[PDB]
Design a protein around this ligand. Structure first.
Ligand SMILES: Nc1ncnc2c1ncn2[C@@H]1O[C@H](COP(=O)(O)OP(=O)(O)OP(=O)(O)O)[C@@H](O)[C@H]1O
Ligand SMILES: Nc1ncnc2c1ncn2[C@@H]1O[C@H](COP(=O)(O)OP(=O)(O)OP(=O)(O)O)[C@@H](O)[C@H]1O
Ligand SMILES: Nc1ncnc2c1ncn2[C@@H]1O[C@H](COP(=O)(O)OP(=O)(O)O)[C@@H](O)[C@H]1O
Ligand SMILES: [Mg+2]
Ligand SMILES: [Mg+2]
Ligand SMILES: [Mg+2]
Lengths: 322, 239, 311
């Protein structure tokens, strides 16, 4: 016995059905549509729609095999990969927070470049989708990062002196890697929601995409939005849609956040913005902050590893160690 | 069947052989309505020798929150001499019924009448969470007020008929959802059918974690009664 | 009305009784049937028999207390959570047939506790367990680590993992669909005695409920109540151990910690566990606070110290 409330039917048709004495989905399957339609005063089209929507409504070993057969996305940071278990995990939503100038955008560019590394070197060999909300995407920086990756991979392959490594690196050229990054631009949050809604079919046609980046999510939602409840509902819906998409399409998702100041008594602490309930949305959360002239990466929340602190650096080659 | 022996503490001066009485409980989560019902059942189910009454009781379970281990622990810790045979003999009288929907509730109400007329010994009835399906049938009926609450009104009519027919005493359990504060949201008829209100409140501090406050009013006198009581593993004890 | 459900129904009487109402059998059972014999024309002796048999097959009959006592003496059970602190906190494991709710802050302990309990039940008792992951918070490497911490045989670990089933549901409708599918398949498979599921864990109910709430709508609250009713009937009418996790909110007027999803959801579970992180000294790591906020067998407000990094 399945209640009608458990189905995504129209409120009007459900009101009519409960008026006519309908409370179970099982009894609906044994009645001709004409008789029920003339009894409840419902036209043929919506009756057929109700009939079809009613009709339409993986052991852990397989999960282990799937997790092991697909790798992580390397960040060119050995310690960060070690504390992440191998890099950014697929099927998981990741969040990055930090004060301006720490290097969130550099990390996003590095990930977009690295996601196309051939699997012979431990990569995923997939495309990337970059969504920009603040206009901080500079092509020259991406070119520099791609050239640095080219040089590093070429040196590693030459030192190892294999055979299939050279073949894999043959097609791994600047034009090929630059042609596999898809760029979108959103100004208002309505445009971001529209692009999110269009994402499923686009990923369906572009089945080789293995990365989705949304650089800047606090900016579209922190200005000219007085109603806090509406913002909370929109953010919850966006998080649910993003995790559903990431799991369905075998994707790694990275979101970028901004810090804010919380004042208690007479001392101030830097905390991530967008309220407290937003903390449950991200599967993995990282925080970048300054200490003297050193940059530190802290794993704040994660259901697989332990809290750690990592020293990283930004160089002309890009995101690196030390 | 006099109200003085049932509960002289809560009921100050209402003593008479009852032709029928309706009592309802209102309170937030974790206040002690179920524990009070357990205490009433324990005081109403034991043999006359151990302060019991030896009269029939029926329990309707709608919240699915009835715990039998707690009840048996309360009965064991209440009496003087404890044994398996006597506890089985005592629990051979308890009655429990399950429900799943308002229509199923009405069907069970109608079906119970066979055993109910076959047993003149039935004198006390317990209903819990008659507002459990309030949101479901409020949303099913849409904006039409008559469309909603209709089956609840029929159930109230049947319950009133039964209780005024065979001289029952009934205890009901409600829920606090909206907002001595009280905001009714049920049907008007059942609101009229009540006789006294048991507002349930709980104190935050751990020193009073076992002490709770009760307020009762009489519909024909509007008199306020206050009561403090202490919960325990053996049951419910008063001040 | 419906045809073929009960014997004695004629194809003429069903359309003859159209005079009063057509909605449900409540018309047949909740009417004054004396006037029906002349309003439409019916035999008195057949009408009462039909009403009696229909009421018989379309209701429930009370069960005596002694029978329920005896049957629970041989049916119910208790399943340890794998943590001595929790076990001594809630009497050496949780009882099947009730609803257990775990409430905590972001990242405190909920998913880890659920995973460790599932690993214990799958290995220490050799029973099937279903996991409903909604927020994506379940990695198989954590389960493998827990199983390695328990035993070392590879085949034992594989067999224990083979009893764990995971389903993804990112909205209320998918969760309702999978739960109803489990209800149907178990109710149909009552004849057998192998492969049954005794514990089902919902990773997060706030993930699929929060978008519906907020505003002046009513459908979200009705859906939440329907999901709660389904979980309660699955736990009680079948004798299963259900564990769900929920978020925690900070009140505005009073500033006290309060479970999410509101007052209507506040009445749903029977046992409440609250997890908090110990600030200042002893922070981070596994060191955390476990408290009992609601129980039907213990006094509330008690305190207990537990760790989530020693298993
Ligand atoms: N080896 C380990 N593996 C996994 N987690 C660990 C380990 N050691 C410690 N932890 C802790 O496990 C916690 C995981 O949090 P968990 O997901 O269980 O909480 P939660 O309240 O359910 O979170 P969420 O709201 O994000 O769903 C982390 O906060 C981390 O500190
Ligand atoms: N053995 C015990 N000793 C002392 N107090 C107990 C014991 N067992 C339970 N309690 C207390 O009984 C109180 C009432 O719990 P219970 O769930 O029965 O309340 P209720 O208000 O009737 O229920 P609901 O919240 O479902 O409406 C709890 O707050 C708990 O602290
Ligand atoms: N070509 C370059 N060579 C070396 N360092 C650079 C280069 N381009 C940018 N950087 C450094 O990388 C940092 C980029 O920070 P950014 O990603 O913009 O932080 P956010 O996105 O949070 O504002 C800057 O602090 C800058 O010093
Ligand atoms: Mg930036
Ligand atoms: Mg209760
Ligand atoms: Mg979690």
């Amino acid at each position: 016995q399945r209640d009608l409330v458990s189905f995504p039917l129209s409120p009007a048709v459900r009101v009519k059905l409960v008026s006519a004495g309908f409370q179970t989905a099982e009894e609906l399957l044994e009645v001709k549509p004409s008789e029920l339609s003339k009894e409840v005063g419902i036209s043929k089209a919506e009756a057929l729609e109700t009939l079809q929507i009613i009709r339409r409504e993986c052991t852990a070993l397989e999960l282990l095999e799937q997790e092991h057969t697909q790798g992580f996305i390397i960040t060119f940071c050995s310690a960060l990969d070690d504390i992440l278990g191998g890099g950014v995990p697929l099927m998981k939503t990741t969040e990055i927070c930090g004060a301006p100038g720490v290097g969130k955008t550099q990390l996003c560019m590095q990930l977009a470049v690295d996601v196309q590394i051939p699997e012979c070197f431990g990569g995923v060999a997939g495309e990337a989708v970059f969504i920009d909300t603040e206009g901080s995407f500079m092509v020259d920086r991406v070119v520099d990062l791609a050239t640095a990756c080219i040089q590093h991979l070429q040196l590693i392959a030459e030192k190892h002196k294999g055979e299939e490594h050279r073949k894999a690196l043959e097609d791994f050229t600047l034009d090929n890697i630059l042609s596999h990054i898809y760029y979108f631009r959103c100004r208002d949050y309505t445009e971001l929601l529209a692009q999110v809604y269009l994402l499923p079919d686009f990923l369906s046609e572009h089945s080789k995409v293995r990365l989705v980046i949304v650089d800047g999510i606090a900016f579209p939602f922190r200005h000219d939005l007085d109603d806090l409840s509406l913002r909370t509902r929109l953010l919850n819906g966006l998080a649910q849609q993003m995790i559903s998409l990431a799991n369905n399409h075998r994707l790694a998702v990275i979101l970028t956040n901004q810090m804010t100041t919380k004042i208690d008594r007479n001392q101030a602490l830097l905390v991530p913005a967008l309220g407290e309930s937003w903390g449950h949305a991200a599967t993995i959360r990282l925080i970048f902050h300054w200490d003297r002239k050193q940059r530190l990466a802290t794993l704040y929340k994660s259901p697989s590893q332990k809290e750690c602190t990592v020293l990283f650096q930004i160089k002309p080659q890009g995101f690196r160690d030390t | 069947s006099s109200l003085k022996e049932i509960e002289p503490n809560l009921f100050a001066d209402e003593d008479s052989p009852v032709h029928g009485d309706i009592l309802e409980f209102h309170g937030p989560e974790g206040t002690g309505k179920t524990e009070m019902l357990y205490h009433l059942t324990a005081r109403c189910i034991l043999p006359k020798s151990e302060g019991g009454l030896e009269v029939e009781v029926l329990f309707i379970d709608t919240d699915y929150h009835f715990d039998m281990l707690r009840l048996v622990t309360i009965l064991e810790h209440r009496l003087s001499q404890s044994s398996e045979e006597i506890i089985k003999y005592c629990l051979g009288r308890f009655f429990l019924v399950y429900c799943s929907s308002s229509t199923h509730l009405l069907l069970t109400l109608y079906s119970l009448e066979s055993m109910f007329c076959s047993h003149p010994s039935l004198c006390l009835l317990i209903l819990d969470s008659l507002s459990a399906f309030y949101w479901i049938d409020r949303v099913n009926g849409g904006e039409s007020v008559n469309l909603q609450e209709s089956t609840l009104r029929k159930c109230s009519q049947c319950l009133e008929k039964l209780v005024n027919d065979y001289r029952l005493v009934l205890f009901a359990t409600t829920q606090t959802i909206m907002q001595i504060d009280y905001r009714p949201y049920l049907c008007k008829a059942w609101q009229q059918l009540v006789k006294h209100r048991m507002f349930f409140s709980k104190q935050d501090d751990s020193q009073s974690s076992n002490q709770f406050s009760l307020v009762s009013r009489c519909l024909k006198s509007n008199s306020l009664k206050k009561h403090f009581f202490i919960i325990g593993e053996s049951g419910v004890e008063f001040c | 009305l419906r045809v073929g459900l009960c014997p004695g129904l004629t194809e003429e009487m069903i359309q003859l009784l159209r005079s009063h109402r057509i909605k449900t059998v409540v018309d047949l059972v909740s009417a004054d049937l004396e006037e029906v014999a002349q309003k439409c024309g019916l035999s008195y002796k057949a009408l009462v028999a039909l009403r009696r048999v229909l009421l018989a097959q379309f209701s429930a009959f009370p069960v005596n207390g002694a029978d329920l006592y005896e049957e629970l003496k041989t049916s119910t059970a208790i399943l340890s959570t794998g943590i001595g602190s929790l076990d001594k906190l809630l009497d050496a494991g949780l009882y099947t047939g009730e609803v257990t709710e775990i409430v905590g802050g972001p990242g405190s302990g909920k998913t880890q506790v659920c995973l460790c309990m599932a690993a214990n039940v799958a290995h220490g008792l050799q029973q099937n367990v279903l996991y409903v992951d909604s927020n994506g918070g379940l990695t198989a490497s954590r389960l493998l680590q827990l199983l390695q911490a328990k035993t070392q045989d590879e085949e034992e670990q594989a067999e224990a993992l083979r009893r764990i089933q995971v389903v993804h549901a990112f909205d209320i409708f998918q969760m309702l669909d999978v739960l109803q599918e489990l209800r149907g398949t178990v109710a149909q498979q009552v004849t057998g005695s192998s492969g049954t599921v005794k514990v089902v864990v919902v990773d997060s109910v706030t993930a699929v409920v929060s978008p519906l709430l907020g505003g002046q709508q009513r459908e979200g609250l009705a859906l939440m109540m329907q999901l709660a009713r389904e979980l309660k009937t699955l736990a009680r009418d079948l004798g299963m151990a259900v564990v769900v996790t929920n978020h925690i909110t900070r009140d505005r007027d009073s500033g006290r910690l309060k479970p999410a999803l509101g007052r209507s959801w506040s009445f749903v579970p029977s046992t409440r566990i609250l997890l908090d992180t110990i600030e200042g000294a002893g922070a981070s790591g596994g060191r955390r606070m476990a408290c009992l906020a609601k129980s039907s067998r213990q006094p509330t407000g008690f305190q207990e110290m537990v760790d989530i990094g020693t298993w």
